[PDB]
Design a protein around this ligand. Structure first.
Ligand SMILES: Nc1nc2c(ncn2[C@@H]2O[C@H](COP(=O)(O)OP(=O)(O)O)[C@@H](O)[C@H]2O)c(=O)[nH]1
Lengths: 375, 176
């Protein structure tokens, strides 16, 4: 149910330097010919009204709803932007690469610029742990994306956890579990897209399945009127425009002020024992260091959805099915009775189950931290 | 502002059944390009005057819907009507919309819906025969439109139907 491309052909699609309507000043590959993508990049590289921060990562969604990450590095006064568009969700690696490429560009080192990009573009995508050299004396190891994000290693989660107070993390989580329309607003683009990526990651092993736009450029502001569930980030400069739309039934988090508006009672409606246990973990230093924060949400997800195992009807002659009536009719509280019934209406839960059913009926054989947590 | 009624519509169907081509016939938009492969969502607008009433329609599409074996009820919140599209030359596209329409019947029965078999313009490649789609439509109590966005056949009629359905629903519900 992940929307990450599982078999990307190259380490990245295109690299651009964009400067001030913004224009592409430089690109790699030199012969990259998708002018529609290039044009799109010019707008997503500057997704705000002129008159912050350096890094941020937008996402373009393709026709099968898989995600392309636009890793960005904004110049000092937003004069130019360096962007690499890739199917690989390697935030720390590409932010670093952007720094190196930007300094080559600055010091007009055209040969090192070309060599790095060409070597990277030609590199067959390696297995987790393999060393990939940026220089002779510097390398990164290919990330293992199956691991939980750790603080402070993971930029998205670290920035999300620093910026957003626990109550608002809980409200974001609750809103996602009801598949609300969710708008996050922030003055810093780094913080903005970290909050979108970081909060969605807390749904693991499930994934946000509908509209997902870590940052929305102004020319696409009307998409906040979308009626299906969404998760959308906008820069603070766009807020008045959005305030104008008089949006009904949207959850809105202002990250700058840690103020959350919601017309729903979602967080209070959730099973209190699960949320208390989560909240308490989030409030301790000891259980929020390293992968503590992600572990806390994982334990909540396991407590909420773990009983799915007992609804797997496995009658021979094939195949394994999911029995909803079984799922909703076994519960340890009235609150969970209501939760389980609601869960059957969630696309994020549907894609999790149908993915398990496929994976189980395949005979593949697997593991992950969610299942370990259930056990 | 410049209309009497605003309705929000969804179009659903596997990628490649011709949803964007249908929406091109639908749209009043100056810019005709689609943002499906940009932000995974697209909307178009049409305004039409029906028996003297100015009606504005928004229609929304999203990317990669074919991966949804079932589209669940949260998707349809706030929507007045749904255009459910398969490709008459693709059996798999039809099996998906049947699951989708059962889910709507069970969990969103209040939403107006029609069934559309697009690309009905090449007999030799037609796989989903009219009889089978028509029979399914009858069972679900909904109307079937076989269309060609390519040739612009039965498209206007299809759009008029879902438009008139949502208009009637609004009027029937206004009357108690
Ligand atoms: N033969 C035929 N082709 C069509 C029709 N409608 C769309 N197509 C073609 O099918 C392909 C996919 O259509 P498109 O609108 O992009 O599909 P979408 O992914 O559902 O939005 C395009 O090449 C269209 O030209 C039709 O009615 N008949």
């Amino acid at each position: 149910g992940s929307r990450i491309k599982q078999n990307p052909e190259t380490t990245f699609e295109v690299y651009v330097e964009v400067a001030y309507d913004p224009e592409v000043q430089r690109q790699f590959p030199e012969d990259y010919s998708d002018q529609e993508v290039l044009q799109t990049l010019t707008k997503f590289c500057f997704p705000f009204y002129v008159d912050v921060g350096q890094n941020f990562t937008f996402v373009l969604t393709d026709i099968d709803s898989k995600q392309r990450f636009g890793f960005c590095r904004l110049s000092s006064g937003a004069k130019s932007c360096f962007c690499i568009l890739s199917y690989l969700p390697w935030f720390e690696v590409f932010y670093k690469l952007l720094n190196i490429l930007a300094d080559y560009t600055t010091k007009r080192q055209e040969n090192q610029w070309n060599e790095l990009l060409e070597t990277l573009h030609k590199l067959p995508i390696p297995d987790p742990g393999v060393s990939v050299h940026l220089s002779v004396h510097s390398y990164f190891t290919v990330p293992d994306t199956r691991e939980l994000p750790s603080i402070p290693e993971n930029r998205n989660l670290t920035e999300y956890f620093v910026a957003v107070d626990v109550n608002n993390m809980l409200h974001l989580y609750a809103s996602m579990l009801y598949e609300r329309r969710i708008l996050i607003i922030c003055s810093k683009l780094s913080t903005l897209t970290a909050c979108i990526h970081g909060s969605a990651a807390m749904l693991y092993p499930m994934y946000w399945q509908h509209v997902y736009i870590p940052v929305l450029p102004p020319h696409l502001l009307d998409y906040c009127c979308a009626p299906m569930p969404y998760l959308i980030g906008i820069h603070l400069s766009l807020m008045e425009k959005v305030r104008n739309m008089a949006l009904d039934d949207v959850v809105i988090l202002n990250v700058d002020t840690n103020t959350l508006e919601t017309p729903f009672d979602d967080l209070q409606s959730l099973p209190n024992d699960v949320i208390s246990s989560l909240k308490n973990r989030l409030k301790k230093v000891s259980t929020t260091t390293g992968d503590g924060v992600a572990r806390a949400f994982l334990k909540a997800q396991a407590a909420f959805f773990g009983s799915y195992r007992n609804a797997l009807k496995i009658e021979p002659e094939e195949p394994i099915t999911f029995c909803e009536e079984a799922f909703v009719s076994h519960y340890r509280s009235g609150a969970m009775r209501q939760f389980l019934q609601n869960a059957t209406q969630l696309q994020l839960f549907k894609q999790f189950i149908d993915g398990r059913l496929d994976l189980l009926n395949s005979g593949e054989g697997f593991s992950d931290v969610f299942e370990e947590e259930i056990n | 502002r410049d209309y009497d009624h605003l309705f929000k519509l969804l179009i659903i169907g596997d990628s490649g059944v011709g949803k964007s081509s249908l929406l091109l016939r639908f749209a009043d938009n100056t810019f005709s390009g689609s943002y499906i492969t940009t932000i995974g969502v697209d909307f178009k607008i049409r305004t039409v005057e029906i028996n003297g009433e100015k009606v504005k329609l928004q229609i929304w599409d999203t990317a990669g819907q074919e991966r949804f074996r079932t589209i669940t009820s949260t998707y349809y919140r706030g929507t007045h009507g749904v255009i459910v599209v398969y490709d008459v030359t693709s059996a798999e596209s039809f099996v998906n919309v049947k699951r989708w329409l059962h889910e709507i019947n069970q969990n969103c029965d209040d939403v107006c819906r029609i069934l559309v078999g697009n690309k009905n313009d090449d007999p030799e490649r037609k796989v989903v025969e009219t009889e089978d789609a028509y029979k399914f439509a009858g069972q679900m109590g909904i109307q079937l439109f076989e269309t060609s966005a390519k040739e612009n056949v039965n498209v206007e009629e299809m759009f008029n139907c879902i438009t008139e359905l949502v208009l009637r629903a609004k009027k029937d519900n206004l009357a108690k």
